[PDB]
């Protein structure tokens, strides 16, 4: 019921299983030999994504958990220009 995402610098980020299942590559990484069904971590060892990019990805996970079909107008998701061009590559890689 919890995922233990880690970055390339070792910064662990823990989100809910349903929060991280929105990404396609996260669901792909968990299913398989990387399952490790001890019901504790189900950790994911990212090799290239930095810590701030994963923080923004988990923020987007919570943002999509909140607003998935809530009315029509959605609150804005501000993205820093410096964190962009790295969040885009992560979102392509995460199939988010």
Q: List contacts with other proteins (CB under 8 A).
A: 1-2, 4, 7, 9-16, 19, 50-52, 55, 57-68, 70-89, 91-92, 94, 96
Q: Which is nearer to other proteins, 31 or 72 (CB)?
A: 72
Residue 48 C-beta: closest distance to other proteins, Å: 12
Take residue 46 and report the two structure tokens written for it. Answer: 């990212």
Query: What is the rounded distance in angstroms from the CA atom of residue 46 to the CA atom of residue 75?
Result: 29
What angle do the packed helices 87-94 and 51-66 form, to 10 degrees?
Answer: 60
Query: What is the rounded distance in angstroms from the CA atom of residue 59 to the CA atom of residue 79?
Result: 11
Residue 42 C-beta: closest distance to other proteins, Å: 12
Q: Which is nearer to other proteins, 35 or 74 (CB)?
A: 74
């Amino acid at each position: 019921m919890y995922v233990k995402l880690i970055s390339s610098d070792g910064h662990e980020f823990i989100v809910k299983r349903e929060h991280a299942l929105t990404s396609g590559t996260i669901k792909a990484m968990l299913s398989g030999p990387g399952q490790f069904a001890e019901n504790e971590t189900n950790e994911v060892n990212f090799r290239e994504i930095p810590s701030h990019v994963l923080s923004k990805v988990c923020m987007y996970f919570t943002y999509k958990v909140r607003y998935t079909n809530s009315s029509t107008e959605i609150p804005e998701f501000p993205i820093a220009p410096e964190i962009a061009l790295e969040l885009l590559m992560a979102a392509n890689f995460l199939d988010c």
